[model samples]
Target: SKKHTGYVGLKNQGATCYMNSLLQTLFFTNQLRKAVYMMPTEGDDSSKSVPLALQRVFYELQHSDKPVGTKKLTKSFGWETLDSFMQHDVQELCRVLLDNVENKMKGTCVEGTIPKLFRGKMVSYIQCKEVDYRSDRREDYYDIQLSIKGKKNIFESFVDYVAVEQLDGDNKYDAGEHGLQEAEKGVKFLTLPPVLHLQLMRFMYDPQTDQNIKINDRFEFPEQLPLDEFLQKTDPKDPANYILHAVLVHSGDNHGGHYVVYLNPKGDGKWCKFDDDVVSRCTKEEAIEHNYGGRHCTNAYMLVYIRESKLSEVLQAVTDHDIPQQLVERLQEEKRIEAQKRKERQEHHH
Candidate 1:
């Protein structure tokens, strides 16, 4: 036999690595088993909806002789408390799990659009019915709107590419109307609202490009100096690199709100949480309101970007932090016992 401490070190690194791999394997096995158990013939849809990791949890919850609570759940997962080992915010962790699961169920690629729900109703304000290029033929000749006022009526303005390009490229542009007003050349009276300007920049950049959808990218609003800094520094080539940003007005004050925009290529049945808080909290309604609410953006419009390799690192970071060793071990034990039970049944029948 190996030395006493031999396998202990591996366990300390956490059960996630081993459990994730094992669970994935078990998921495939379970699917096969289900197919074999089907009375007489296989059906058109033989795939499993839940991940094996989650399935293990479900299996335990359903079959356990005793009821499980949060305390028991945490202990089983090898954690003192749910908060102890969860490195990210509780709510956010829920968001990731939900988002990932939702995508898997829909048969959508994780790389496309990750679902995001906003606080307000969807608005078609900036969406183009068709390409209405300005007669001038200049790239700058475009309409930017701050809001959808009176249904079809919207506040709009036209600005040249040079002005937009300069603004988008410079963090210094974030100084607000006063900052622009204080510009060396003096601010010109541009009709386009800053909010509209911000949205236009996001719209131009495809949601999939790294240039627009990065976690760090922020949408700046009036008076937010840092968001201005982020927008100025964002690259134009990869839009997804930038964060999905919006401006909101509360009590005549303006603020910025940003969320990672993803297109769920899988569409329905996908699971997602807004941020880490969503994960820890475990409730979607609460998470949405607390993080992406009315006073913040007043509009919870989500643009779909198909889930892909773009967020692999983020996903890995989340799973490692959230899944505790105790839970992993419990799952593994359940698997082992289930396998033993199946083997016994087969041998007896034979």
Candidate 2:
């Protein structure tokens, strides 16, 4: 059998799967990796700084062959408000990391690189039923939140229009004779970035259980996502073609569960599963089939996609200087072994 190599694993201490999974996914983002690697390390090496901690971790992930411990990186989170031992949401961690980097690099050239890569504008249109007036409000978001309630696919839940009930006390405008009435609220994309992040809202509070629980509902997503239909102003020159590159999956309920990631490192259609300290090859079909949710379900929590046109740019960002020769050699050897295993399997079947 062929053995996969190249990337080193992260040793989990307590409930560090969330951090491990997010780190692996971030490692696959070539732009982010290059930026972190290229960051000047001349300043004081404080463990509190997220960017600094990430710089060290990224270096080990790219150069070292053995599983690396994240004690330093985990300690950096303790300096913030979040508890290092507590299980936190991966999406929230992502935001914190981005904010930390932006804050640390303020006034610098790479202050808002994360936002530049993933931030997008969304316009919310609220129309009054009585008058012909419509209000459009714009909001910036790093990720698109998709609700998984009564929805089988992304299209059903990500509908353009939603019915909103305006109450008497909480009325946006002056309430007419009909104290409380209904209005239509529509949402559309105003602008999109090179990288898109989508979060599946699967955790909700349950009165019966008195705790947050995961929704084990089936929700399907496409490999190639089309966002032109959802945009308020479409650009013919820059089509909204996004290809899936990473998926952060949660296999347990809200109380507790393991986190894993399926990532396409080079965007060559090959994917691998990053489960804590182990990395193994996986099929695209296996990655997509994780949509089915049930007991011990492994549904996707967050999906990362890249713009089709900018794929090459992202890939080119990881040059020979960024990669260690030892890691490259190991990856080549693994590829050769995988090919030989395939040949043997084919012969056995014949």
Candidate 3:
């Protein structure tokens, strides 16, 4: 068997498996890591804590010899209601991280650095049945939430379709009022970002169980998900192409479940599974195959993709452009040490 090495594992604090898995995925996102790493940590106040904490986490992840604890980052969350040991949604954590970084880096960081990378604009059009009036609105989204009920996979959900709802007769748009009646709604992507995040809506409230439950639908996803078909207005020269780089998977029911990630490290068509602290090489098929949901089945809860052209730029940013030489050398040294330890363990077992 080929030995896989280099990546650092994170320590799980109580129900922090969610955090560990998300951090691993973020660490593998070279561009995001580079952005967080290059961010200035000079401010002396508490406002600079989030980015500074992130910088420290990335630094340790690259330099540390053993699994790292995200004490600083966790504390930076500043969640009033949620305890440190409570399980939380990884998607919400991502949002909080991005928003805090953006707010803290105000006036210091370039505008649209984070948004341009992850955010996309969508246009929603709703038409009333009785009248020819139509309302159009544009909204920005960091991630696309795809429902797995009627759709076979992520692509089907991305396609342009119309949804009809028989609205109540109330046509007032107020504090406690509904907007339109007998509405026909259509949604489509107006712009796609360099990095795309997709969340699969697998967890739903079941009336029978009277608890939030997971749906074990067998929806298939592609390795290289092309968005040329989903683009609102297609262009021949600059087609929006997306390649899957990371998948955050959940492998249990609502009350309790384990989180793992399948990561494509360099966009070189290779994948590996990050199950808590253990990292092992896996085939692309193996990464996407197990998430269909059955006995011992795993379902993909979140996905990360990068534009094909942007992949090289992100890799360069992390490896050559922004990162320091000493830090790079230290990262290599840590990986070498870990590989040696693994080999020694194997020999001892033999």
Candidate 4:
């Protein structure tokens, strides 16, 4: 209608504006987009096929000039249709979708694609005052939760995430060999993925308030994130710089809120707001500065950062040739049959 940004939006489906926002965020992440297209979906059951449904939706987003619907994709989630009226968390939605899709990608050409794109490692340890009892573990995480309580910005929250806790006095660390001993314990980033998801801890329980309230504290994040120190990376020559890819915002607090994602699809300065059924190019101020919270009700909830060295490879475009013909035919046939049934039923051929 208005001067278009050439980017389509996602239909809200009455209660899923939040879903639409994250869907666009994932779609614009072209690395994930292209990998989903490469999945071998020939003769795959459509009833609960998450990856195939994702492929259909992403394909439509690429070709459709108008808003795209996600009902088909939602159906594949095997959701209780009546329960769809209730709200769902975008963070959980991302996890479920990616988890299911990652499973389907197994044995496919893109088997390790999800891990390379989103997985990272962290080390958790309980280092006793005596080195005799020190022990550590390496764990995998697709996303990280950073505390926003009294935190001014994303960097500070990250600092708190890796801050070591001293176990002494009454709160002593239990060492198998040394009994209750003083210790230092916490987690540290061991490795980082090409893409990063940092969820700001906006909601927390407050005893005085007797409820969980949204934190409206000012939390700032930068366009370029430096993680060399957080990773405790020794080599300065190594690429540890991360570029901001998207900023997902929320406009309300604890009871309820709306979700929206600001995407720099081109990996450039331009930012576009993908608000359900509407796509509009916006200023960097509207996308970043205005969402720093405190005075602003609408603030960033999730930050998507792309590794600098992997930028080009991630944002790389996909072609129709890259997509499997059988998958295309299947989705197209489904749409055609759906349209025919809709019109044929209205005819009432008595």
lDDT of each: 0.26, 0.70, 0.70, 0.82
Model 2 residue 1 distance off true place after TM-score fit, in angstroms = 14
Q: Which ten residues in a row have the lowest lDDT in candidate 1?
A: 1-10
TM-score each candidate.
0.22, 0.81, 0.81, 0.92
Strongest candidate by lDDT: 4
User: What TM-score does model 3 achieve against the real structure?
Assistant: 0.81
For model 1, the stretches where C-alpha displacement exceeds 4 angstroms are 1-50, 67-86, 108-350
lDDT of 3 by residue, 90-131 (tens): 678888888877665567554456786788888887666666
Score residue 122 of candidate 3 by CA lDDT. Answer: 83
Whole-model alpha-carbon lDDT for candidate 2: 0.70
Model 1 — TM-score against the truth? 0.22
Clashing pairs in 3: 291-298
- What are the per-residue Cα lDDT tens digits for candidate 4 across 139-238? 9998888898788887898889999999999999988767899899999888888889888878777899897677888899999888887885545666
Separately for all candidates shown, the number of backbone clashes (residues 3 or more apart, or on different chains) is 70, 0, 1, 0
lDDT of 4 at 6: 80
**Cα-lDDT of candidate 1:** 0.26
| lDDT over C-alpha atoms for residue 277 of model 1 | 12
Runs of candidate 4 exceeding 4 Å displacement: 1-3, 79-89, 208-210, 254-256, 344-350
Question: Per-residue lDDT for 1-350 in model 1, tens only?
Answer: 01211110101122221122122111122222221122121111112323343434434432333322222223333344323433432223334433434444353322222222111111111111123211121122111222222122111211222122222234333343333211211112212111112222212223565432212112222111222111223334433232212121111111113222211112222323222011111233322233233223333222121122232322222223233455446556655876798899999999
Q: How well is each residue in 1-350 modelled by candidate 2, as lDDT tens digits?
A: 11375667777666665678788877777787776654444453445656667766776676567675676677776622235424465667788877766566566556666776778887877666766666688888887777877878766656623324453345555435634444556677788788887788787778998986778788888888887777778999989888888888888664357778888877777888877778888899777776446445778878888988888766555656874454345444544765798899999999
